[PDB]
Amino acid sequence: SLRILKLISYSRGIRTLIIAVGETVYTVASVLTLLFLLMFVFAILGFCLFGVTDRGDLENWGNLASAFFTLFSLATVDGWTDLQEELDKRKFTVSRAFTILFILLASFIFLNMFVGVMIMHTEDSMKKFERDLTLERNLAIMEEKQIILKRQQEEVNRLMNTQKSG
Amino acid sequence: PLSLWAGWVLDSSVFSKFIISLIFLNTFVLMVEIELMESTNTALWPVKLALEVADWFILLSFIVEILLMWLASFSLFWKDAWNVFDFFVTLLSLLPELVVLLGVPAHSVWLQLLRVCRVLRSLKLFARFRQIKVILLALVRALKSMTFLLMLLLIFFYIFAVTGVYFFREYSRSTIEGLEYNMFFSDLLNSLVTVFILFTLDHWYAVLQDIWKVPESSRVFSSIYVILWLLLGSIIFRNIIVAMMVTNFQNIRSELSEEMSHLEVQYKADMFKQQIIQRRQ
Amino acid sequence: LLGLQQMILSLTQSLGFETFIFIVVCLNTVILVAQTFTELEIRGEWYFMVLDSIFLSIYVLEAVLKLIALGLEYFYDPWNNLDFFIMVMAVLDFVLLQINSLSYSFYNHSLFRILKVFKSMRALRAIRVLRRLSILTSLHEVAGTLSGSLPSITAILTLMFTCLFLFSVVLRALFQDSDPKRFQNIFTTLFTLFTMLTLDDWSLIYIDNRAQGAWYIIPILMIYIVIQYFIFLNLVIAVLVDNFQMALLKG
Amino acid sequence: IYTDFQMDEREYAMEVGGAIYFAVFITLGAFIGLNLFVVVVTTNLEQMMK
C-alpha cells in the first residue's frame, strides 16, 4: 500500500489539490488536540464516576484503553444505545444525564466545528487562487491589447512615412 | 403530416394532458398489482387483470409514441441527448412483452429492472419544475467539478482497504466457535464492504467489540490503525466534499451577482446614451 | 345587526380577546400540562376531563364568536382555518361521547387515541396563542432567516421523495421470495428504506443477508445508500449554509 | 425501539400512523438541528475571518 501511495504520488493535479489543502494541517492538528483534551477530561471523569467504585461497568469505564474507546464511541453516534442500557443498571441515575450532556457537547462541537472550519478554509483558499487566475488572465488580455495597439501605431507610422516619402 | 403532425401533437395541450395523466395513472397502478395476485377477492380478480392489461395498453401507447418519434428526424434521433436514453428505456419496457410471449419466464426474467427503468423514466418525464431544474443544473455542474476529488476518495479507500485486509487476519482466520462478524474480514470484497461500513460509521462500537474477541495483543497497532482510518477518512472526506459544495454555491452566486452587476451597468449606460440622443436631437 | 354589529364586534373583540381569551387559555394549558403528565393522572382522572370539557366549551364559545364575527377575513388566516378544523373535531368527539349507546368498540380504542392527539394539537394551539407577547426578536430573526429559503428545501425533499420511492420500488422488486417478512408490504418497505437512509443497522442487514443466498443485492443497496446519503446531506447543508450566509453578508 | 413498538396488530394498527408521524418528525428535527449547528459554526467562523 505504501508502494501504491508512491504510485499516486504522481498526478500533478492531485499535487495541486494537496497544495491547496495543505495550509489546514495546523488547524486540523489544533482541533485534534482540543478533541484529545476533551477525551482526557471525560476519561478521568468517567473513570472517577464508574470504575473506582468497582461495582460493575468494567472494560467500559474501567481499564484506560477500553474506556478511551468507549468514550470515542460515545462521542460518535455508534453504540450509545447499548452503552446506555449497560450503564443504567449500575445504580447511577445521573449517569444518563452525564452521558447525554457528554453527547450534546462532544459530538456536536467536534462535528460542527470541524465542518465549519474546513468549509471556511477551503472557501478562502479557493477564492484567492481563482482571483489570481482571473488576474493573470486579465494581465494577458491587457498585454495582447497593448501589443495590438503598438502594431497598429507602427503600421500607421509606416504608412505615414511611405506617404511622405512618395 | 409527419413532422408537422408531431409538432401539432406536441403543441396541443390536450395530448400533453392525456399523456401525463396516463403516465401518473400507470405509476399509481403499477405497484398495486404486486400486492395481491391471489383469490382473496374473486370479484376484483378480473378487474385487476384488466388493470395489468391497461398497463400493457400504456406500453402500446409507448409504441405509438415511438411512432410519433419516427415521424420526427428519424435516423438523426439515434444519437442525441437524454431523449435517446428515454427511447432506450421505452424499448426495454417493450421487451417484457416479447419475453413473456416467447421467453417462457420461468427463469431469471429481469422484468423488474425494466419495470423500474420505465418507472424512473416516467418519474423524470413529469414536466419537471423550475425549482427542480435549477438545482439539477447545480448538481450536474457539481458532478462536472467532481474531477479529482472522487479519484482521491476511491484511491484512499483502495489503499486503506488493501492495508486492512491482512491486519485483522486472525479475526476471520481463527478457530473461535462463537463469532458473527467473521464474514466481514474474510475476502477482499468483504474487506471492501466492511471498510465501507466503517466509512459510513454505523455500529463501529459494536464492530470493535466483536473484533475484541481476538486475543488482545496490547492493541499496539491494529485497533489504533482501524480507528484512525475510520475517523480520519470519514471526517476528511465528508468535510472536503461539503467544502467544495459550498464553494460551488459561492461561485454560482458570484457569477449571478456579476451578471446582474453587468446588466445594471449596461442599463445605466443605456439611459445615459438615451439622454445623449435626446440632447442630440 | 349589520356593519354596526361588525364594528361593535371588532372593538369589543379587541377588548375581550385581549382580556378573556388570554387568562382562560393560560388556565387551559395549565390544566392540560397537568393532564398529560403521566404520573398525576392517577392523582385525579376525575377532576381532569371535567375541566377538559369545560375548557372545550370555552373553545367552542370562541368558535361561536369567531363565526358570528367578520367571517371571510378570519377564514383567510391559516391559523384560524386550523382553529375551525380544531373546533370541528372537538364538537365531533364531544357529541360522540355525549350520545353514548353506539355500536362500535370503546374503552381506550384507536378512536380514543385519535381524540387524544386532537386534544394534543388543541394544546399546541393554546401554546401558540399564548405567545402573542415576547416571542423574542433574536429567535424571531433566526426563524425568519431559516424560513427564507423554502423553495430550495422543498425541491430537495421532493428529490428525496422521488429517489426514496424509486429505491423502495426496486428493493421490493428484487426482494420477492427473499424472506420479505421485514418489508412484506408498502409501509414496511418504505420504513426499511427510511432506516436505510438513516443509517440504522444496515451492517446488520448485510450480515443477515449474507446468511441468505443472494449476495449482489448488497453492493446495489450499498451504492444506493451512499449516493442518496452524500447527495442529500451535502445539498441541504450547503443550501442552508448559504441561506444564512447572505443574511450574514447583509446587516 | 422499532422492534419494541412492533407487532401492534402485525398489519397496520397504530404501527403505521404513529411510526410515520414520529419518523418524519425525527428526520425533520435531526436535519434542522444539524443544519442549524453547522450554520452557527460557519457564521462565527466568518466572524473570525472578518
mmCIF file of N, CA, C and O in Angstrom, chain B residues 30-31 34-35 112 115-116 119-120 123 130-132 135 139 180-181 183-184 190 193 196-197 199-203 207 238 241-242 245-246 249-250 253, chain C residues 151 154-156 158-159 162 166 168-170 172-173 176 186 199 201-204 206-207 210 218 222 226 230-231 233-235 237-239 241-242 245:
data_model
loop_
_atom_site.group_PDB
_atom_site.id
_atom_site.type_symbol
_atom_site.label_atom_id
_atom_site.label_comp_id
_atom_site.label_asym_id
_atom_site.label_seq_id
_atom_site.Cartn_x
_atom_site.Cartn_y
_atom_site.Cartn_z
ATOM 1 N N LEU B 30 -49.156 0.619 -11.028
ATOM 2 C CA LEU B 30 -48.097 -0.378 -11.173
ATOM 3 C C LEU B 30 -47.826 -1.133 -9.878
ATOM 4 O O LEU B 30 -47.647 -2.357 -9.892
ATOM 5 N N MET B 31 -47.793 -0.432 -8.751
ATOM 6 C CA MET B 31 -47.372 -1.086 -7.525
ATOM 7 C C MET B 31 -48.555 -1.695 -6.774
ATOM 8 O O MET B 31 -48.354 -2.413 -5.788
ATOM 9 N N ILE B 34 -48.730 -5.760 -7.648
ATOM 10 C CA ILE B 34 -47.783 -6.639 -6.965
ATOM 11 C C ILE B 34 -48.205 -6.965 -5.541
ATOM 12 O O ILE B 34 -47.625 -7.869 -4.924
ATOM 13 N N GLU B 35 -49.209 -6.267 -5.005
ATOM 14 C CA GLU B 35 -49.628 -6.504 -3.627
ATOM 15 C C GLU B 35 -50.361 -7.834 -3.488
ATOM 16 O O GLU B 35 -50.098 -8.605 -2.558
ATOM 17 N N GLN B 112 -38.136 -6.922 -13.556
ATOM 18 C CA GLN B 112 -38.210 -5.890 -12.528
ATOM 19 C C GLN B 112 -37.274 -4.727 -12.833
ATOM 20 O O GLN B 112 -37.603 -3.569 -12.553
ATOM 21 N N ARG B 115 -38.943 -2.721 -15.453
ATOM 22 C CA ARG B 115 -40.080 -2.048 -14.834
ATOM 23 C C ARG B 115 -39.634 -0.811 -14.064
ATOM 24 O O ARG B 115 -40.233 0.262 -14.190
ATOM 25 N N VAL B 116 -38.559 -0.931 -13.281
ATOM 26 C CA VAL B 116 -38.084 0.227 -12.532
ATOM 27 C C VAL B 116 -37.427 1.240 -13.465
ATOM 28 O O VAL B 116 -37.428 2.444 -13.177
ATOM 29 N N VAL B 119 -40.319 3.111 -14.763
ATOM 30 C CA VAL B 119 -40.848 3.908 -13.660
ATOM 31 C C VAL B 119 -40.008 5.165 -13.451
ATOM 32 O O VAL B 119 -40.550 6.260 -13.264
ATOM 33 N N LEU B 120 -38.677 5.038 -13.496
ATOM 34 C CA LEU B 120 -37.833 6.220 -13.349
ATOM 35 C C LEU B 120 -37.943 7.143 -14.556
ATOM 36 O O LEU B 120 -37.874 8.368 -14.403
ATOM 37 N N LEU B 123 -41.093 9.009 -13.886
ATOM 38 C CA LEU B 123 -40.861 9.946 -12.795
ATOM 39 C C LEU B 123 -39.949 11.100 -13.187
ATOM 40 O O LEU B 123 -39.926 12.115 -12.484
ATOM 41 N N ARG B 130 -39.312 24.429 -12.437
ATOM 42 C CA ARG B 130 -38.139 25.295 -12.498
ATOM 43 C C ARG B 130 -37.252 25.078 -11.282
ATOM 44 O O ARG B 130 -36.019 25.097 -11.393
ATOM 45 N N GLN B 131 -37.875 24.825 -10.131
ATOM 46 C CA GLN B 131 -37.156 24.662 -8.878
ATOM 47 C C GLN B 131 -36.538 23.277 -8.776
ATOM 48 O O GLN B 131 -35.659 23.048 -7.936
ATOM 49 N N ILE B 132 -36.968 22.351 -9.635
ATOM 50 C CA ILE B 132 -36.225 21.110 -9.812
ATOM 51 C C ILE B 132 -35.047 21.323 -10.756
ATOM 52 O O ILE B 132 -33.924 20.887 -10.465
ATOM 53 N N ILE B 135 -31.758 23.301 -9.392
ATOM 54 C CA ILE B 135 -30.901 22.532 -8.500
ATOM 55 C C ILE B 135 -30.339 21.314 -9.222
ATOM 56 O O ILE B 135 -29.264 20.820 -8.867
ATOM 57 N N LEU B 139 -26.481 20.467 -9.474
ATOM 58 C CA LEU B 139 -25.941 19.146 -9.163
ATOM 59 C C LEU B 139 -25.091 18.596 -10.304
ATOM 60 O O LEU B 139 -24.041 17.989 -10.061
ATOM 61 N N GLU B 180 -19.785 -13.777 14.989
ATOM 62 C CA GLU B 180 -20.776 -13.448 13.972
ATOM 63 C C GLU B 180 -20.357 -12.346 13.009
ATOM 64 O O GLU B 180 -21.073 -12.120 12.030
ATOM 65 N N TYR B 181 -19.239 -11.656 13.240
ATOM 66 C CA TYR B 181 -18.709 -10.685 12.289
ATOM 67 C C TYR B 181 -17.460 -11.200 11.582
ATOM 68 O O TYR B 181 -16.684 -10.405 11.041
ATOM 69 N N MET B 183 -17.368 -12.948 8.873
ATOM 70 C CA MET B 183 -17.597 -12.818 7.441
ATOM 71 C C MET B 183 -17.139 -11.456 6.921
ATOM 72 O O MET B 183 -16.791 -11.339 5.742
ATOM 73 N N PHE B 184 -17.069 -10.450 7.800
ATOM 74 C CA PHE B 184 -16.710 -9.093 7.396
ATOM 75 C C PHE B 184 -15.293 -9.022 6.837
ATOM 76 O O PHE B 184 -15.049 -8.368 5.816
ATOM 77 N N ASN B 190 -15.250 -8.635 0.792
ATOM 78 C CA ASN B 190 -15.755 -8.474 2.150
ATOM 79 C C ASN B 190 -15.008 -7.367 2.881
ATOM 80 O O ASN B 190 -15.606 -6.608 3.654
ATOM 81 N N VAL B 193 -16.415 -4.150 1.680
ATOM 82 C CA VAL B 193 -17.727 -3.909 2.277
ATOM 83 C C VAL B 193 -17.581 -3.424 3.718
ATOM 84 O O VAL B 193 -18.252 -2.477 4.142
ATOM 85 N N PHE B 196 -16.180 0.063 3.867
ATOM 86 C CA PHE B 196 -17.260 0.976 3.513
ATOM 87 C C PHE B 196 -18.217 1.171 4.683
ATOM 88 O O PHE B 196 -18.689 2.287 4.924
ATOM 89 N N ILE B 197 -18.503 0.098 5.424
ATOM 90 C CA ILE B 197 -19.325 0.208 6.629
ATOM 91 C C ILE B 197 -18.656 1.127 7.644
ATOM 92 O O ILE B 197 -19.307 1.986 8.254
ATOM 93 N N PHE B 199 -16.605 3.494 6.886
ATOM 94 C CA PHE B 199 -16.691 4.832 6.307
ATOM 95 C C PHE B 199 -18.036 5.487 6.603
ATOM 96 O O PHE B 199 -18.089 6.663 6.982
ATOM 97 N N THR B 200 -19.137 4.747 6.428
ATOM 98 C CA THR B 200 -20.443 5.276 6.820
ATOM 99 C C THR B 200 -20.594 5.409 8.330
ATOM 100 O O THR B 200 -21.475 6.151 8.778
ATOM 101 N N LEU B 201 -19.762 4.716 9.112
ATOM 102 C CA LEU B 201 -19.724 4.830 10.572
ATOM 103 C C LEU B 201 -21.068 4.457 11.207
ATOM 104 O O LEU B 201 -21.743 5.275 11.835
ATOM 105 N N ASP B 202 -21.446 3.194 11.025
ATOM 106 C CA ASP B 202 -22.620 2.621 11.673
ATOM 107 C C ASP B 202 -22.176 1.451 12.538
ATOM 108 O O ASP B 202 -21.534 0.517 12.040
ATOM 109 N N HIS B 203 -22.524 1.506 13.826
ATOM 110 C CA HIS B 203 -22.198 0.465 14.805
ATOM 111 C C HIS B 203 -20.704 0.144 14.825
ATOM 112 O O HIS B 203 -20.298 -1.019 14.902
ATOM 113 N N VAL B 207 -18.815 -3.188 16.151
ATOM 114 C CA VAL B 207 -17.791 -3.828 15.329
ATOM 115 C C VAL B 207 -16.502 -3.996 16.126
ATOM 116 O O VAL B 207 -15.876 -5.064 16.113
ATOM 117 N N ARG B 238 -15.960 13.675 4.111
ATOM 118 C CA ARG B 238 -17.216 14.407 4.238
ATOM 119 C C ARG B 238 -16.960 15.908 4.235
ATOM 120 O O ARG B 238 -17.674 16.676 3.574
ATOM 121 N N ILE B 241 -15.803 17.297 0.703
ATOM 122 C CA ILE B 241 -16.910 17.331 -0.247
ATOM 123 C C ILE B 241 -17.895 18.446 0.103
ATOM 124 O O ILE B 241 -18.367 19.164 -0.787
ATOM 125 N N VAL B 242 -18.197 18.644 1.395
ATOM 126 C CA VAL B 242 -19.111 19.742 1.727
ATOM 127 C C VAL B 242 -18.453 21.105 1.489
ATOM 128 O O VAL B 242 -19.132 22.068 1.097
ATOM 129 N N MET B 245 -18.740 21.743 -2.095
ATOM 130 C CA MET B 245 -20.127 22.065 -2.432
ATOM 131 C C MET B 245 -20.481 23.514 -2.118
ATOM 132 O O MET B 245 -21.103 24.201 -2.944
ATOM 133 N N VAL B 246 -20.107 23.989 -0.929
ATOM 134 C CA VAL B 246 -20.391 25.382 -0.617
ATOM 135 C C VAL B 246 -19.556 26.299 -1.502
ATOM 136 O O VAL B 246 -20.023 27.372 -1.880
ATOM 137 N N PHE B 249 -21.562 26.601 -4.675
ATOM 138 C CA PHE B 249 -22.649 27.550 -4.469
ATOM 139 C C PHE B 249 -22.124 28.982 -4.436
ATOM 140 O O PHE B 249 -22.760 29.895 -4.979
ATOM 141 N N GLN B 250 -20.948 29.187 -3.833
ATOM 142 C CA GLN B 250 -20.357 30.522 -3.768
ATOM 143 C C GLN B 250 -20.050 31.054 -5.158
ATOM 144 O O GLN B 250 -20.375 32.201 -5.475
ATOM 145 N N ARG B 253 -23.319 31.815 -7.148
ATOM 146 C CA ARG B 253 -23.908 33.087 -6.744
ATOM 147 C C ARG B 253 -23.033 34.267 -7.152
ATOM 148 O O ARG B 253 -23.558 35.328 -7.504
ATOM 149 N N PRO C 151 -38.521 27.307 -1.091
ATOM 150 C CA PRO C 151 -38.424 26.564 -2.332
ATOM 151 C C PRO C 151 -37.243 25.610 -2.442
ATOM 152 O O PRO C 151 -37.413 24.498 -2.961
ATOM 153 N N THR C 154 -37.837 22.585 -0.206
ATOM 154 C CA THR C 154 -38.940 21.789 -0.744
ATOM 155 C C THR C 154 -38.505 21.015 -1.983
ATOM 156 O O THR C 154 -38.895 19.855 -2.159
ATOM 157 N N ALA C 155 -37.691 21.637 -2.846
ATOM 158 C CA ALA C 155 -37.145 20.935 -4.004
ATOM 159 C C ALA C 155 -36.308 19.746 -3.572
ATOM 160 O O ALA C 155 -36.432 18.647 -4.129
ATOM 161 N N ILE C 156 -35.458 19.946 -2.569
ATOM 162 C CA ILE C 156 -34.570 18.870 -2.156
ATOM 163 C C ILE C 156 -35.359 17.739 -1.494
ATOM 164 O O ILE C 156 -35.099 16.557 -1.750
ATOM 165 N N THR C 158 -38.460 16.988 -2.168
ATOM 166 C CA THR C 158 -39.139 16.320 -3.277
ATOM 167 C C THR C 158 -38.202 15.354 -3.998
ATOM 168 O O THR C 158 -38.615 14.260 -4.406
ATOM 169 N N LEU C 159 -36.937 15.747 -4.168
ATOM 170 C CA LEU C 159 -35.960 14.847 -4.778
ATOM 171 C C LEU C 159 -35.734 13.603 -3.921
ATOM 172 O O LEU C 159 -35.581 12.496 -4.451
ATOM 173 N N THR C 162 -38.816 11.305 -4.463
ATOM 174 C CA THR C 162 -38.705 10.579 -5.727
ATOM 175 C C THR C 162 -37.647 9.479 -5.653
ATOM 176 O O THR C 162 -37.904 8.329 -6.034
ATOM 177 N N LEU C 166 -38.248 5.409 -5.701
ATOM 178 C CA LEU C 166 -37.594 4.567 -6.699
ATOM 179 C C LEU C 166 -36.791 3.445 -6.046
ATOM 180 O O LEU C 166 -36.855 2.286 -6.483
ATOM 181 N N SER C 168 -37.210 2.178 -3.003
ATOM 182 C CA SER C 168 -38.137 1.246 -2.372
ATOM 183 C C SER C 168 -38.778 0.325 -3.402
ATOM 184 O O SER C 168 -38.932 -0.877 -3.156
ATOM 185 N N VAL C 169 -39.144 0.870 -4.566
ATOM 186 C CA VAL C 169 -39.744 0.057 -5.621
ATOM 187 C C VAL C 169 -38.757 -0.997 -6.107
ATOM 188 O O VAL C 169 -39.097 -2.181 -6.223
ATOM 189 N N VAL C 170 -37.508 -0.594 -6.364
ATOM 190 C CA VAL C 170 -36.542 -1.561 -6.886
ATOM 191 C C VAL C 170 -36.150 -2.584 -5.817
ATOM 192 O O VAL C 170 -35.936 -3.762 -6.134
ATOM 193 N N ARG C 172 -38.122 -3.660 -3.262
ATOM 194 C CA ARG C 172 -39.251 -4.575 -3.151
ATOM 195 C C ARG C 172 -39.334 -5.497 -4.360
ATOM 196 O O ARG C 172 -39.717 -6.666 -4.227
ATOM 197 N N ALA C 173 -38.960 -4.997 -5.541
ATOM 198 C CA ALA C 173 -38.956 -5.828 -6.739
ATOM 199 C C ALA C 173 -37.874 -6.904 -6.685
ATOM 200 O O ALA C 173 -38.100 -8.035 -7.130
ATOM 201 N N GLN C 176 -38.384 -10.183 -3.786
ATOM 202 C CA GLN C 176 -39.506 -11.112 -3.808
ATOM 203 C C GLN C 176 -39.036 -12.523 -3.460
ATOM 204 O O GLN C 176 -37.987 -12.975 -3.933
ATOM 205 N N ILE C 186 -46.214 -2.207 1.757
ATOM 206 C CA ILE C 186 -45.781 -0.878 1.336
ATOM 207 C C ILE C 186 -45.146 -0.124 2.501
ATOM 208 O O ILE C 186 -44.052 0.448 2.373
ATOM 209 N N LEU C 199 -29.256 5.197 8.378
ATOM 210 C CA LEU C 199 -28.051 4.508 8.858
ATOM 211 C C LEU C 199 -28.329 3.683 10.111
ATOM 212 O O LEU C 199 -27.607 3.768 11.107
ATOM 213 N N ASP C 201 -28.600 -0.033 11.325
ATOM 214 C CA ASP C 201 -28.369 -1.475 11.214
ATOM 215 C C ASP C 201 -28.316 -1.952 9.766
ATOM 216 O O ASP C 201 -28.759 -3.060 9.453
ATOM 217 N N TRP C 202 -27.769 -1.136 8.864
ATOM 218 C CA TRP C 202 -27.555 -1.631 7.511
ATOM 219 C C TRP C 202 -26.392 -2.609 7.452
ATOM 220 O O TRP C 202 -26.389 -3.505 6.602
ATOM 221 N N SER C 203 -25.431 -2.484 8.369
ATOM 222 C CA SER C 203 -24.444 -3.541 8.557
ATOM 223 C C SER C 203 -25.108 -4.832 9.023
ATOM 224 O O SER C 203 -24.724 -5.927 8.594
ATOM 225 N N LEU C 204 -26.109 -4.721 9.902
ATOM 226 C CA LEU C 204 -26.866 -5.895 10.327
ATOM 227 C C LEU C 204 -27.644 -6.500 9.165
ATOM 228 O O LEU C 204 -27.758 -7.727 9.053
ATOM 229 N N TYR C 206 -26.714 -6.331 6.024
ATOM 230 C CA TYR C 206 -25.691 -7.007 5.231
ATOM 231 C C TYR C 206 -25.320 -8.362 5.830
ATOM 232 O O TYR C 206 -25.232 -9.365 5.109
ATOM 233 N N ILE C 207 -25.138 -8.424 7.152
ATOM 234 C CA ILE C 207 -24.680 -9.676 7.751
ATOM 235 C C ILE C 207 -25.798 -10.722 7.814
ATOM 236 O O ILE C 207 -25.517 -11.925 7.761
ATOM 237 N N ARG C 210 -26.194 -11.955 4.102
ATOM 238 C CA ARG C 210 -25.165 -12.930 3.757
ATOM 239 C C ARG C 210 -25.568 -14.337 4.177
ATOM 240 O O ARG C 210 -25.164 -15.315 3.537
ATOM 241 N N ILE C 218 -26.355 -6.663 -2.013
ATOM 242 C CA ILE C 218 -25.622 -5.886 -1.014
ATOM 243 C C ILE C 218 -24.822 -4.756 -1.667
ATOM 244 O O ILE C 218 -24.887 -3.626 -1.161
ATOM 245 N N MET C 222 -25.711 -0.871 -1.020
ATOM 246 C CA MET C 222 -24.601 -0.030 -0.584
ATOM 247 C C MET C 222 -24.463 1.216 -1.449
ATOM 248 O O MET C 222 -24.357 2.335 -0.925
ATOM 249 N N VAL C 226 -25.045 5.160 -0.350
ATOM 250 C CA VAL C 226 -24.008 6.180 -0.295
ATOM 251 C C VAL C 226 -24.368 7.346 -1.206
ATOM 252 O O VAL C 226 -24.213 8.511 -0.815
ATOM 253 N N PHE C 230 -24.738 10.938 0.820
ATOM 254 C CA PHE C 230 -23.908 12.034 0.276
ATOM 255 C C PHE C 230 -24.716 13.156 -0.384
ATOM 256 O O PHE C 230 -24.608 14.324 0.025
ATOM 257 N N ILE C 231 -25.521 12.834 -1.410
ATOM 258 C CA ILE C 231 -26.144 13.882 -2.215
ATOM 259 C C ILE C 231 -27.094 14.726 -1.371
ATOM 260 O O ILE C 231 -27.032 15.963 -1.396
ATOM 261 N N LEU C 233 -27.326 15.083 2.108
ATOM 262 C CA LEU C 233 -26.796 15.878 3.211
ATOM 263 C C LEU C 233 -26.020 17.053 2.671
ATOM 264 O O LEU C 233 -26.105 18.159 3.210
ATOM 265 N N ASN C 234 -25.274 16.823 1.591
ATOM 266 C CA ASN C 234 -24.450 17.862 1.015
ATOM 267 C C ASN C 234 -25.311 18.976 0.442
ATOM 268 O O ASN C 234 -25.049 20.162 0.693
ATOM 269 N N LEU C 235 -26.395 18.610 -0.254
ATOM 270 C CA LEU C 235 -27.300 19.611 -0.808
ATOM 271 C C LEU C 235 -27.928 20.462 0.290
ATOM 272 O O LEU C 235 -27.894 21.695 0.225
ATOM 273 N N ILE C 237 -27.065 20.841 3.537
ATOM 274 C CA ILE C 237 -26.084 21.562 4.340
ATOM 275 C C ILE C 237 -25.614 22.807 3.604
ATOM 276 O O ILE C 237 -25.610 23.909 4.165
ATOM 277 N N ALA C 238 -25.254 22.663 2.321
ATOM 278 C CA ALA C 238 -24.821 23.828 1.557
ATOM 279 C C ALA C 238 -25.941 24.840 1.393
ATOM 280 O O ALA C 238 -25.707 26.051 1.494
ATOM 281 N N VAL C 239 -27.162 24.362 1.128
ATOM 282 C CA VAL C 239 -28.281 25.262 0.871
ATOM 283 C C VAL C 239 -28.569 26.111 2.102
ATOM 284 O O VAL C 239 -28.696 27.335 2.010
ATOM 285 N N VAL C 241 -26.496 26.645 4.669
ATOM 286 C CA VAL C 241 -25.323 27.459 4.977
ATOM 287 C C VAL C 241 -25.346 28.747 4.165
ATOM 288 O O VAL C 241 -25.181 29.844 4.710
ATOM 289 N N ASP C 242 -25.606 28.645 2.856
ATOM 290 C CA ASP C 242 -25.699 29.874 2.073
ATOM 291 C C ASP C 242 -26.938 30.679 2.451
ATOM 292 O O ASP C 242 -26.894 31.915 2.411
ATOM 293 N N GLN C 245 -25.964 32.614 4.937
ATOM 294 C CA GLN C 245 -24.760 33.361 4.606
ATOM 295 C C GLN C 245 -25.079 34.677 3.890
ATOM 296 O O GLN C 245 -24.373 35.672 4.105
#
